[PDB]
Each structure stands twice: as structure tokens, then as C-alpha cells.
Write a protein that binds this ligand. Structure first.
Ligand SMILES: *N(C)CC(=O)NCc1cccc(CNC(=O)CN(*)C)c1
Lengths: 85, 14
């Protein structure tokens, strides 16, 4: 599996929920990001595919006030904007 | 679904 490299801001985000390395598989990046969103309770209690990130670092990194977990292609685009090319 | 079940669907695309 291909190893990818987070930029400094994303890296600090992943290391806040136990991540220990400088490079990751994409399944690992998606693991730590999910643990972040769910630990901080950013998902809507009632409509659990929708994430509110307006007052969070994640909103600054992704450039949105919210997104939907159904939009797979859009989540991948937003993650790849935050990886070293 | 639960947040966990929607989020699992992304693992698939990886
Ligand atoms: N791709 C990394 C995601 C995936 O499908 N595997 C990681 C995984 C598996 C099982 C459980 C979790 C964490 N889930 C929770 O903490 C709560 N949701 C039920 C992650």
C-alpha cells in the first residue's frame, strides 16, 4: 500500500489522536481523521453523515464550514490538498 | 446510519 506525507497542519491534527509517524497509508490517514471527528463530536447527532467544522482547525484545512461523508470524491480531494506532492 | 457506518464506506475507496 502506497505511503503518503501529510503537511504540518494535518500532521499535528492526526498526532492529536495518537498517530506516531511522518508517513501513512490512506486507510491509516482515514482512521485517525475519523477518530478526530468523532472524539470532538463534530458530526450532527441526528443526521450523522453531516460534519460541522466552522469553529475547528479542520474547517480551515478543508476550506468549508461543513461537508457530507457521502461525498467520497470530495473528501479525497480535500485530503490530497493537505498532502506533500 | 451511525457516523461509523458512513465513514467505513471511504475505507472501501482506498
Ligand atoms: N478505514 C481506515 C476505516 C475502516 O473501515 N477501518 C477502521 C475502523 C474499523 C473499526 C472501527 C473503527 C473505529 N470506529 C469507532 O470508533 C466507532 N464507530 C462504530 C475504525
Amino acid at each position: 500500500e502506497t505511503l503518503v506525507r501529510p503537511k504540518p497542519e494535518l500532521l499535528k491534527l492526526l498526532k492529536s489522536v495518537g498517530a506516531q509517524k511522518d508517513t501513512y497509508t490512506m486507510k491509516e490517514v482515514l482512521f485517525y481523521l475519523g477518530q478526530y471527528i468523532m472524539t470532538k463530536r463534530l458530526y450532527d447527532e441526528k443526521q450523522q453523515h453531516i460534519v460541522y467544522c466552522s469553529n475547528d482547525l479542520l474547517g480551515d484545512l478543508f476550506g468549508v464550514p461543513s461537508f457530507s461523508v457521502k461525498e467520497h470524491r470530495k473528501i479525497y480531494t480535500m485530503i490530497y490538498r493537505n498532502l506533500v506532492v | 446510519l451511525t457516523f461509523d457506518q458512513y465513514w467505513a464506506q471511504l475505507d472501501s475507496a482506498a
